[PDB]
Design a protein around this ligand. Structure first.
Ligand SMILES: Nc1ncnc2c1ncn2[C@@H]1O[C@H](COP(=O)(O)OP(=O)(O)O)[C@@H](O)[C@H]1O
Ligand SMILES: Nc1ncnc2c1ncn2[C@@H]1O[C@H](COP(=O)(O)OP(=O)(O)O)[C@@H](O)[C@H]1O
Ligand SMILES: [Ca+2]
Ligand SMILES: [Ca+2]
Ligand SMILES: [Ca+2]
Ligand SMILES: [Mg+2]
Ligand SMILES: [Mg+2]
Lengths: 82, 74, 126, 375, 160, 375, 82
């Protein structure tokens, strides 16, 4: 009987500790999950913005190349015309 | 050629679903019966035409709806 | 508000839709009868000699050929509509779909069954 | 439910048989696929001792049995035992006679033909089903993710295979099937545990080593740093209680067991790890669908449940792949049953309802019908 | 258990207390006259088949607003009885499509707010501002004042 | 718009189909003319997989298709595919039924008769247009420049032809049609890329090589000096990122690919370059209109968009031509769509409104009506 | 005493299961936390890349307009020489 009472007591104490720690961990996980969702949305927006900027930069580079080549050709033509 | 295919199909229709109405030597009773069966055929063709018209109208409306939803895709 | 009233409103809309479909079907039948009265003139060929019967049969044969050409055109247009519908449905499944997989549920909690099986049937619902 | 007829989505697997009716979320009955005859003599009379305990019953009497899996590497090596397993699955775990239900088995890629033909012959002659269909285990796992492209690495317990798919068109020339899987990891763990003194030999103790592997092992993000850390500190040593007491302490055996996946030279296999056979499977594909496959890498199967594998694999592939492409690894939480969920979805489709191998068709062409149009 | 609870709602609320007694006959220890937070959490975590907390949160998100799992009596009914599944396949989709075709009177493929009022008048139901505002909020997912066909299907997804 | 009736200015081309209503500035829908059947097996059920993706849809699924152009060199080699392309163009890219719109196709000079007759027969029987007219692709490009004289070099993607015109009177004996065009340049570029290690073989990778050619290649002003410079410095090596990473570096392949135009001996063709067939086409003309043709040389077509070609060609012709004449090369910035802009202008004219081939005329004389007065 | 011992055994079993579930929740939480760390790093990288591309685009616009003005001046010069 003495042994059984000891075992009952210590088991009950340990069980209470376990349930409380489990609930606390669950709460922490909930908060961390919400933060992760927010950061994921921010990452998606950053990706789309970077894509837009890259497209614009590529277009500008192409147009600049075209215009520069035109300038070079007309430069040489002007010298010969002089 | 698919245009040759459609010409062939139309020509076969003109030579398959059409009967030879050379019933001049038939009796007056039998000529009346043939006229009655022709009237039945005319009614059947008109009923098929009306059903086709209603199906075409419903298809056009549903195609307009699907075009609008395609505009709603993006 | 609550949801039972919304369910009642939805069921009323469904019943109104069924009534409208029935009314449109009746209207289609009435218009088919009107078309039969209009296009299909009463044709009585009683007492005519063979020659008039042959002439009228030949004329009806020509008219039937014209109607068959018209029906062929309309059926070709219907096949065109079917092709368009198939293409549009394919495009919708390609674009509006992707993540449009069905949402199935078979993991219902069989709590009431266990309660009714191990504690009698005091529950007057299930 | 009621009228109508539901399909049975069975999934033989190798290590766990997963089954259930089509249209649900999870398999109804999941139980190990082992058939164990008793090995001792037996003195009590009238105890009602059977001659073979199958399924989950032999995981409770395993102390006096000799468990033996009927499926070695995808292929089936012992047809009588497999028939017994199927009979148990149909009659006792689901309690539905097969005479009134279509079945949808699953099979690994690149398996011997005779295995598939014998499977269909059994299903049509012994159990006498109305119609059965065999599907590749990776396409289903791609169904479950709700994608339509992507390269799926289905590291089961028998065999690890890597099927790339684009826009619904499978690429048959880019399937890389490797025979390292969970069972070899269990054997290697059982072999390296002997370095501390714990010897597991009996076929029953293989189950204990499997439990140790499931509960403790994890995949290291960087192998050399972990080997150095575990050799200096003692923050990794996790203990575990055997089925009789005498707790054991696992040191750097924790991340060395599942490391075999990325370095198959540990168990003497020549081939490259699961981190490099995926990249090779991608590079065999055409040059214009490599970006989509890079972005939609899918993980499935049981063995891909190790804590920390979805990061190690991404790091490795990012090291191998060109720097511009984005590498993304889809690791759904329902990884273990992904194949069966996909099987349920496929069996629930209306478009699929005419692809079953109807019994009259089998009667006209014999078991070789499976290789024909009804694949 | 939506329909069974709805039908038993023809009787008093005290029947709920009797339910608690039955629940206590399983897991005795309840005293508040209802399936409280202790009872609900314990049964959702112990009954042998454990619904995932993700599944519980997703099912609760139909009615639960705070995201915790604690509600009042009628809201508890609406939140919890809706969890179980009764509907099957949501009838036939082509029937819904034909009925929606007959719905949109102006033939544009959209159900506007005016069309919604016309449908309410066709049903003959009492003119109630709260129900009209609820329909306006619900049917209009994209905040344009109108209703589409897929929006109608979502509205009727699971409704006989 | 409203009442009335607008004409459809289609322009089959070879490589890009350009179409749009008459009276605008630019074609409404421009998309490659390729029809690609899928080549793999396909395992997903109900994915809605079609049997042939045409137009711009097959440039996105090209990873699992076998694209094949229906027009080889001006002429049409696969009539079913061309009919499919036309059907797509009318119904999905413009969404106007052809029963209510005249059409104005375009055709290269010196093409087989049967091609033109079959084209008109298709347009009148299958699509059932009210009236169609076929015009030579160079006269339109001369319309778009707003000139009335000049010798136009229309270097398309299929065939390069050089039609001289004076005061509106075309000179039929001075048309020099050469079959080197953009497609042969793509093949030659794909063949010389192998000298660095990059191998493109699949018909899908021909599109990647075409993109490389468009974005990087340029025509050298002087060939030998560029060959010497690229062999000493490294200021020319421009890099390019494939559809999956693994950037490539193009060295002196940049100006060697389009140099084939001026030296057709590179791809084994005997004839002289586009710099000398223009001078030969001029010299066949009468002695009194050579000055005007020298001063009004017009460039058109896609392949004449290489950066630096309007100077190389002028230098070459000035070398060939007598020293007194002034050589001027008209190179409008809207070169690619010059033929279609000219087609729109021609279809919008009131004087032209009675030149269409009306359907009753076709019914009376058959498809051979096109060679008759209604040209 | 035997009855108390039996109840103690039941308590021990329940405590065992509670510890299992608590450790599982702890595992989930720590894994998600490390994932959030990684995702935050990636989002920061995306921000940096997008800002870089924007700067490139502005520079390209300026160069474009400069070269265009040069080309127009050269056009006027060529017309005069003609
Ligand atoms: N949680 C886990 N952690 C680590 N390994 C696991 C886990 N669950 C299962 N496994 C391993 O995966 C195997 C089960 O794989 P499974 O997907 O059932 O194979 P099959 O494809 O034959 O169904 C087991 O043998 C075990 O070794
Ligand atoms: N910007 C460009 N630079 C260089 N080559 C080009 C460019 N655009 C198009 N091309 C070449 O021209 C071809 C398109 O020519 P196009 O005028 O469309 O032919 P068609 O006369 O059949 O319409 C393409 O195949 C490509 O090889
Ligand atoms: Ca709440
Ligand atoms: Ca409306
Ligand atoms: Ca709306
Ligand atoms: Mg498996
Ligand atoms: Mg052209």
């Amino acid at each position: 009987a003495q042994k059984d009472e000891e075992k009952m007591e210590i088991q009950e104490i340990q069980l209470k500790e376990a349930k409380h720690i489990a609930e606390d961990a669950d709460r922490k996980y909930e908060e961390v999950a919400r933060k992760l969702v927010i950061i994921e949305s921010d990452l998606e927006r950053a990706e789309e913005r970077a894509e837009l900027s890259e497209g614009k930069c590529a277009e500008l580079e192409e147009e600049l190349k075209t215009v520069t080549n035109n300038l070079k050709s007309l430069e040489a033509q002007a010298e010969k015309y002089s | 050629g698919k245009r040759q295919t459609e010409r062939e199909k139309k020509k076969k229709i003109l030579a398959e679903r059409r009967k030879v109405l050379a019933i001049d030597h038939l009796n007056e009773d039998q000529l009346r019966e043939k006229a009655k069966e022709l009237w039945q055929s005319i009614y059947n063709l008109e009923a098929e035409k009306f059903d086709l018209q209603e199906k075409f109208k419903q298809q056009k409306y549903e195609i307009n709806v699907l075009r609008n939803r395609i505009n709603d895709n993006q | 508000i609550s949801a039972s009233r919304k369910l009642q409103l939805k069921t009323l809309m469904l019943q109104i839709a069924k009534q409208e479909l029935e009314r449109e079907a009746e209207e289609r039948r009435g218009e088919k009868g009107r078309a039969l009265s209009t296009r299909c003139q009463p044709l009585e060929l009683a007492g005519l000699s063979f020659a008039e019967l042959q002439d009228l049969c030949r004329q009806l044969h020509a008219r039937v050929d014209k109607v068959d050409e018209e029906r062929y055109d309309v059926e070709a247009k219907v096949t065109k509509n079917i092709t368009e519908i198939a293409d549009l449905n394919q495009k919708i499944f390609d674009l509006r779909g992707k993540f449009k997989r069905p949402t199935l549920r078979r993991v219902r909690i069989s709590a009431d069954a266990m309660m009714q099986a191990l504690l009698g049937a005091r529950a007057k619902e299930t | 439910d009621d009228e109508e007829t539901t399909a049975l989505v069975c999934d033989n697997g190798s290590g766990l048989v997963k089954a259930g009716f089509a249209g649900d979320d999870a398999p109804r009955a999941v139980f190990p696929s082992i058939v164990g005859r008793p090995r001792h003599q037996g003195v009590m009379v009238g105890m009602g001792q059977k001659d073979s305990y199958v399924g989950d019953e032999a995981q409770s009497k395993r102390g006096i049995l000799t468990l033996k899996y009927p499926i070695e590497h995808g292929i089936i090596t012992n047809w009588d035992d497999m028939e017994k397993i199927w009979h148990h699955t149909f009659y006792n775990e689901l309690r539905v006679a097969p005479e009134e239900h279509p079945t949808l088995l699953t099979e690994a890629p690149l398996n011997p033909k005779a295995n598939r033909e014998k499977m269909t012959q059994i299903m049509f002659e012994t159990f006498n089903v109305p119609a059965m269909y065999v599907a590749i285990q990776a396409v289903l796992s791609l169904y479950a993710s709700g994608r339509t492209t992507g390269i799926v690495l289905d590291s089961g317990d028998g065999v690890t295979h890597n099927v790339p798919i684009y826009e619904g068109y499978a690429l048959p020339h880019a399937i890389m099937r490797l025979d390292l899987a969970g069972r070899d990891l269990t054997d290697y763990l059982m072999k390296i545990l002997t370095e501390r003194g714990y010897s597991f030999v009996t076929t029953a103790e293989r189950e204990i080593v499997r439990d140790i592997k499931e509960k403790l092992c994890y995949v290291a993000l960087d192998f050399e740093n972990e080997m150095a850390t575990a050799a200096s500190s003692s923050s990794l040593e996790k203990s575990y209680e055997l089925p009789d007491g005498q707790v054991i302490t696992i040191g750097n055996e924790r991340f060395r067991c599942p490391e075999t996946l990325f370095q198959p030279s540990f168990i003497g296999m020549e081939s490259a790890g699961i981190h490099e056979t995926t990249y090779n499977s991608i590079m065999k594909c055409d040059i214009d669908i490599r970006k989509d496959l890079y972005a939609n890498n899918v993980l499935s199967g049981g063995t891909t449940m190790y804590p920390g594998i979805a990061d190690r694999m991404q790091k490795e592939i990012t090291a191998l792949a060109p720097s511009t492409m984005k590498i993304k690894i889809i690791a759904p939480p329902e990884r273990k049953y992904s194949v069966w969920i996909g099987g349920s979805i496929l069996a629930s489709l209306s478009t699929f309802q005419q692809m079953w191998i109807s019994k009259q068709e089998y009667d006209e062409a014999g078991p070789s019908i499976v290789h024909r149009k009804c694949f | 258990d939506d329909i069974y609870k709805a039908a038993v709602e023809q009787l008093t609320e005290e029947q709920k207390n009797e339910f608690k007694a039955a629940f206590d006959i399983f897991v005795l220890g309840a005293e508040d006259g209802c399936i409280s937070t202790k009872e609900l959490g314990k049964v959702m975590r112990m009954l042998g088949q454990n619904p995932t907390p993700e599944e519980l949160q997703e099912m609760i998100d139909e009615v639960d607003e705070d995201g915790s799992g604690t509600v009042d009596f009628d809201e508890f009914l609406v939140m919890m009885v809706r969890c179980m599944k009764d509907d099957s396949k949501g009838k036939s989709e082509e029937e819904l499509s034909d009925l929606f075709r007959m719905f949109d009177k102006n033939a544009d493929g959209y159900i506007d707010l005016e069309e919604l009022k016309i449908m309410l008048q066709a049903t003959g139901e009492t003119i109630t501002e709260d129900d009209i505002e609820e329909l306006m909020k619900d049917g209009d997912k994209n905040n344009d004042g109108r209703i589409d066909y897929d929006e109608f299907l979502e509205f009727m997804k699971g409704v006989e």
